[PDB]
């Protein structure tokens, strides 16, 4: 993994994220939603587990993006949890949770759930 | 379970649901959100697994409520998945998924996730 993870990944909706997997489990990079402008680039930080098994198992990882940058503040944060699978067709299969800051009465509807698959192509 | 399940349950937000657990795993009843009016009563249907283990394990179950009745159509449905635990303080601990009908472009944000704990008190 690690080396295999570092690079650019694209999901099915048009988002891109570039990440560096450091020697001791760190993941650091940027997530860009669309257009191709600095305005849709947000910082991402996460971790991956740097000594994955040798039975062809995926590498468990996760990262968070807070949706605030210098052009936008969407008062929300998204975390992606999943695993990296390398090889010919490497992919990161994830499930995500997006929480928006709400008032206490609207807290019950503050989190959306979805999934995303990222590829290098 | 079964017998223990049949009855009225209340969650932490003020909702109530009355359900009948039939001999062969069926769950049928009504879910009422608030006020105490026919208008907030919706049909619920689900299933429970009628031969649960004997190591004190909970009874797995689930039910669905479509948010449409004669006074309201909220174009959405909620499913609750969890387990019933009996005894002095019986409760049904659940995690739920609420999906609203969306257009294909908004499908990525069509499902909310949460949790609810129901008691007899």
């Amino acid at each position: 993994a690690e080396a295999g993870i570092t690079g650019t990944w694209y999901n099915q909706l048009g988002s891109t994220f570039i990440v560096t997997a450091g020697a001791d489990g760190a993941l650091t990079g940027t997530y860009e939603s669309a257009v191709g402008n600095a305005e849709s680039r947000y910082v991402l930080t996460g971790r991956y587990d740097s000594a994955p098994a040798t039975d062809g198992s995926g590498t468990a990882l996760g990262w968070t993006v807070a949706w605030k940058n210098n052009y936008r503040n969407a008062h929300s944060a998204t975390t992606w949890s999943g695993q990296y699978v390398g090889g010919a067709e490497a992919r990161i299969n994830t499930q995500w949770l997006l929480t928006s800051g709400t008032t206490e009465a609207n807290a019950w509807k503050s989190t959306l759930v979805g999934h995303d698959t990222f590829t290098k192509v | 379970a079964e017998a223990g399940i049949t009855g009225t349950w209340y969650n932490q937000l003020g909702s109530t649901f009355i359900v009948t657990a039939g001999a062969d795993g069926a769950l049928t009843g009504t879910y009422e959100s608030a006020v105490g009016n026919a208008e907030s009563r919706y049909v619920l249907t689900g299933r429970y697994d009628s031969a649960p283990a004997t190591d004190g394990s909970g009874t797995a179950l689930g039910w669905t409520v479509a948010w449409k009745n004669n006074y309201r159509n909220a174009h959405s449905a909620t499913t609750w998945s969890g387990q019933y635990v009996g005894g002095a303080e019986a409760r049904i601990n659940t995690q739920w998924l609420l999906t609203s009908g969306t257009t294909e472009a908004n499908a990525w944000k069509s499902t909310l996730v949460g949790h609810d704990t129901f008691t007899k008190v």
Partner: peptide, 8 residues
Amino acid sequence: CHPQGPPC
């Protein structure tokens, strides 16, 4: 037009 969606 949440930043996690397309476009924006």
